[PDB]
């Protein structure tokens, strides 16, 4: 009977039924006998579900680090003590690995924390295991409340009506006002009342904040003028974090700069910032067809939200190392690099999702007459010109850049490195004068990133624009978003749908972010190791990368286990090998296609049906090879997983021994 939310799949004798049923479990629009109100109610409950999952994930974080961590010892020395995350329990482990996995002064096999959670918790006020445990318990409580509310808001009495959901402008305004301004104000209040006094060296808790004294003004100027009294005595350059040495009395300042010891922003400045955010949001909360088409299609909202999330995630990734905001995080390079890479890849995936769901909207919810001569129909009427100009700019940025790289490469190879092509990054130097030092390599890498970015935009927008129709198939709307092909007729029509455009653009996204992170990691490793001239004189030609970064820094990671012994990086070497392997195993689905495998499976079916001791057992469903779209999807998943795993293993393997 599975899937019950369909009839076409329920009558499929083959194994394709299971694959396609799992494929569209959350395609709530396509379930038979579905109404809009039921759609919105199920969406509400499912969002409650994802929120509860996030809360339980954070609760597990907190509980596991409180139970098996070393928070107190790391607090006693945040420079020469490595934080730990979860103890290791594997029966298949050996004795040598067990002895080699006892690190950071622990009493057994434990895995290290490479996300910088210790510094974040230290900054916000956590000072003991009890605080972490209470936080985990409260997170489990709130997750349970969220789950119960998700169940409750589905009951017939409490089920919201569709008209209530249709007030998209009202809910959006309520969001932007309350959920942002009030939350920022509450966080600022927590900061001022607890965190800053905690940093200054005095213990503050739930049993003391009622009778504590945040500022001698006593909230009096908050309803009057003389606001400057809140910053009458800031901290001192010699002030020691978590100590009363040079502790000030100010709570809301705008001094800026970096702390002399923690190398991060001032807590008073952060409180001021979230306060300015909160007041701006509170003030702004009360105050052709695009603004209504936004409220008409779900996929348009999803695409806009995903694009905004990706852009802000890239912004966060840049700022978290341009302007570190956590104490003792700029002296721990590994977590910084890991977080940068992680949120950068997340931002890329989010942007690709925005583009994909926008193409889905174009296929499904677009209407010609209701969206007549708006900002949207103009793009559809002139797709060819914009695609052509993208193709021109892509090739112009690519041909000459690759030529410059290979020309420098061949010129240096012949033993005459004094006649390369070096172009200075003048505009970056001007903006920095009016950060880091930029040379020709940085110029070339930023240009290559721009090239790959315009290319990925080319594929994404081409798919979005030609999703509705094209010259090959003037009726692509009737064929749905995702379909294999249109047969070998008309010269062959392989890999044509907009889903296939997403398929193509995913690889370019992976390449773009890969170049970005390669550049970032190589420059930062050159800086940290005290050898900057290496990057300056070895990044002009492409051969320097291979012999300096990839080969040069994959020397101790690759030595995780040797015929002589096992060290602490063994698991990362195993993950590295698994990464190349999982990347390689996707090539099967990428290259080879279905028909050969279908014939092979028919041969295997014959073999099974005509052998003794096995005809007694027969398949419930007739085996068939995976469909074309299934092959593409599974190959893409294996490819991406292998890529991510490989680069993460490389990053921790290369950076951790350095520190």
């Amino acid at each position: 009977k599975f899937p019950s939310f369909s009839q076409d799949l329920a009558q499929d004798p083959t194994t394709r039924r299971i694959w396609y049923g799992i494929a569209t479990v959350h395609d709530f629009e396509t379930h038979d006998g579905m109404t809009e109100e039921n759609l919105y109610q199920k969406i509400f409950a499912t969002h409650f579900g994802h929120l509860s999952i996030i809360f339980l994930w954070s609760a597990g974080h907190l509980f596991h680090v409180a139970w098996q961590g070393n928070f107190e010892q790391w607090i006693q020395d945040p420079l020469t003590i490595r934080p730990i995350a979860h103890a290791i329990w594997d029966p298949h482990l050996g004795d040598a690995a067990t002895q080699a996995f006892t690190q950071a002064g622990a009493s057994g096999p434990v895995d290290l924390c490479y996300s910088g959670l210790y510094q974040w918790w230290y900054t916000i006020g956590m000072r003991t295991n009890g605080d972490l445990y209470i936080g985990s318990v409260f997170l489990m409580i709130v997750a349970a409340v969220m789950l119960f509310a998700g169940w409750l808001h589905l009951q017939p009495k409490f089920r919201p009506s569709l008209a209530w959901f249709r007030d998209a402008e009202s809910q959006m305004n309520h969001h932007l006002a309350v959920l942002f301004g009030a939350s920022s104000l509450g966080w600022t209040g927590h900061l001022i009342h607890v965190a800053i006094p905690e940093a200054r060296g005095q213990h503050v808790g739930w049993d003391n904040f009622l009778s504590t004294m945040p500022h001698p003004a006593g909230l009096a100027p908050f309803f009057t003028g003389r606001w400057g009294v809140y910053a009458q005595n800031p901290d001192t350059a010699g002030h020691i974090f978590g100590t009363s040495e040079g502790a000030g009395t100010a709570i809301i300042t705008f001094i800026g700069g970096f702390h002399p010891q923690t190398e991060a922003l001032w807590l008073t400045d952060i409180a001021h910032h979230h306060l300015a955010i909160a007041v701006m949001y509170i003030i702004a909360g009360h105050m052709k067809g695009l603004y209504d088409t936004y409220n008409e299609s779900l996929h348009f909202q999803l695409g806009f939200h995903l694009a905004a999330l990706g852009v802000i995630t890239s912004v966060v990734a840049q700022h978290m190392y341009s302007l570190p905001s956590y104490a003792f995080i700029s002296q721990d390079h590994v977590t910084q690099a890991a977080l940068y890479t992680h949120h950068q890849y997340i931002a890329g995936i989010l942007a690709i999702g925005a583009f994909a769901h926008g193409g889905i909207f174009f296929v499904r919810d677009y209407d010609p007459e209701r969206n007549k001569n708006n900002v949207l129909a103009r793009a559809l009427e002139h797709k060819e010109a914009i695609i052509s100009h993208l193709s021109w700019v892509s090739m112009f940025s690519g041909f000459h850049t690759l030529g410059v790289y290979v020309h420098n490469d061949t010129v240096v190879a012949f033993g005459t490195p004094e006649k390369q092509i070096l172009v200075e990054p003048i505009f970056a130097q001007w903006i920095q004068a009016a950060f880091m030092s930029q040379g020709p390599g940085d110029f070339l890498v930023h240009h290559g990133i721009a090239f790959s970015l315009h290319v990925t935009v080319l594929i994404c927008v081409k798919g979005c624009l030609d999703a509705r129709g094209s010259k090959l198939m003037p009726d692509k709307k009737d064929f749905g978003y995702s379909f294999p092909c249109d047969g070998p007729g008309r010269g062959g029509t392989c890999d044509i749908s907009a889903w296939d455009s997403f398929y193509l653009a995913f690889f370019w996204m992976l390449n773009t972010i890969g170049w970005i992170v390669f550049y970032f990691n190589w420059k930062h490793l050159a800086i940290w190791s005290g050898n900057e001239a290496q990057f300056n004189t070895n990044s002009t030609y492409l051969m320097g990368w291979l012999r300096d970064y990839l080969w040069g820094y994959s020397a101790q990671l690759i030595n995780g286990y040797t015929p002589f012994g096992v060290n602490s990086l063994s698991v990362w070497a195993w993950i590295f090998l698994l990464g190349h392997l999982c990347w390689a195993t996707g090539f099967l689905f990428l290259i080879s296609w279905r028909g050969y495998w279908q014939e092979l499976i028919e041969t295997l079916v014959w073999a099974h049906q005509r052998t003794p001791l096995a005809n007694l057992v027969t398949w419930k469903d007739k085996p068939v090879a995976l469909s074309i779209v299934q092959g593409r999807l599974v190959g893409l998943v294996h490819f991406a997983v292998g890529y991510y795993v490989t680069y993460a293993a490389f990053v921790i393997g290369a950076t951790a021994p350095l520190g």
Partner: peptide, 30 residues
């Protein structure tokens, strides 16, 4: 500074409840 048995057990018995609520929510959804 080291968590004794009592807090571990009470944390676990708290953790039972969200499991039941999640199972109920899943059953209600489908």
């Amino acid at each position: 500074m080291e968590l004794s048995d009592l807090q571990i057990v009470i944390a676990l018995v708290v953790a039972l409840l969200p499991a039941l609520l999640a199972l109920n929510l899943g059953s209600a959804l489908s």
